[PDB]
């Protein structure tokens, strides 16, 4: 995703699913190659100690002054018609200048953005339609003209453009914070288990303090872990052995 040669236009933002792997987030948060690295509802360092069922890397390209629209509850052409984040987003936004790659003498027009739409996009909605936008009361019937405009427009990416207008590559990492089996964990190592003692335990990011004992609960093959009345954990399933 980050080393991808070619990025998708913001209106047709690419999505890459990450599953069943170890995520060494250091390679990102220790790198100096990024201008914007903004994580909402999460700190990247702690991601080394966390598991998830899925991660989604949404990749695209915009101009610099629109990077601010990549954030929860923002407005504008991008956040409205191209790529909308939810207000309760939990994940990271990474953006870095790509003038050396996406801009050329004479202007690179391969990257587009949607200029018109009858309504704002819902979070993580993807609209790739090229329907003629009916600005007026007259049906267009797929014919451009007065009050009938093509919904997309190219970015003018020249190397001499202002940093505000220069191309920036954007990657959006979203985590599947669900109660289900997790296949995306961090590089943190595991240790041996100690029973019948007061310990500070961490099971797949579920942290706590208590005494772990062999249970007699009739857990089902799928049950990840149990709770008591107070919505608190009462029994767990060892990630390493059943």
């Amino acid at each position, epitope marked *: 995703v980050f080393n991808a040669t070619r990025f998708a236009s913001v209106y047709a933002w690419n999505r890459k699913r990450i599953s069943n792997c170890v995520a060494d987030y250091s390679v990102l948060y220790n790198s100096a190659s990024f201008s914007t690295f903004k994580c909402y509802g999460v700190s990247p360092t702690k991601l080394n100690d966390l598991c998830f069922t899925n991660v989604y890397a949404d990749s695209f390209v915009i101009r610099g002054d629109e990077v601010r629209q990549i954030a929860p509850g923002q407005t504008g052409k991008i956040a409205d018609y191209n790529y909308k984040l939810p207000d309760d987003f939990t994940g990271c936004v990474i953006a870095w200048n790509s003038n050396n790659l996406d801009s050329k003498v004479g*202007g690179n027009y*391969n990257y587009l953005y949607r200029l018109f739409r009858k309504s704002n996009l819902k979070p993580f909605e993807r609209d790739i339609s*090229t329907e*003629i936008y009916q600005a007026g009361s007259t049906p267009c019937n*797929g*014919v*451009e003209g007065f009050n009938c405009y*093509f919904p997309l*427009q190219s970015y003018g990416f020249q190397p001499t453009n202002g940093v505000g207008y220069q191309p920036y590559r954007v990657v959006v990492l979203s985590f599947e914070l669900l109660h289900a089996p997790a296949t995306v964990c961090g590089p943190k190592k595991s240790t041996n288990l100690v029973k019948n003692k007061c310990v500070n335990f961490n099971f797949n990011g579920l942290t706590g303090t208590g005494v772990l004992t062999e249970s007699n609960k009739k857990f089902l093959p799928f049950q990840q872990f149990g709770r008591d009345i107070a919505d608190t954990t009462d029994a767990v399933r060892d990630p390493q052995t059943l």
Partner: nanobody
Amino acid sequence: VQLVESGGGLMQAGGSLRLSCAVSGRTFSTAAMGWFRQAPGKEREFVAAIRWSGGSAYYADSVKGRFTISRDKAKNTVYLQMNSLKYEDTAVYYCARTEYVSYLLSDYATWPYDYWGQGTQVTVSS
């Protein structure tokens, strides 16, 4: 990337000719194709444009109701059907291509295009 024109040549007034322009070589994307013409001693002049997506067409006033621009995406070819030929249509006709996507089709009349064909002579006789 090359634009290869064909067709045209000599035709008597009132007749019809078709020009072709085939795009060869690796393209990332095509926004629009256009036809221009240059009569001897005169400035090169817009004739017609077509958006690659959707196929909406824009015409110079001088050719409306006479010329039709069309596209075959699979053949990466643009056509100009030149009906009701007049002496004033005598010119070298040039194919043009751009990757610039404007929301506004009429922009293709005045947009500087990136790629140009070699030009094909059309001569209208009596």
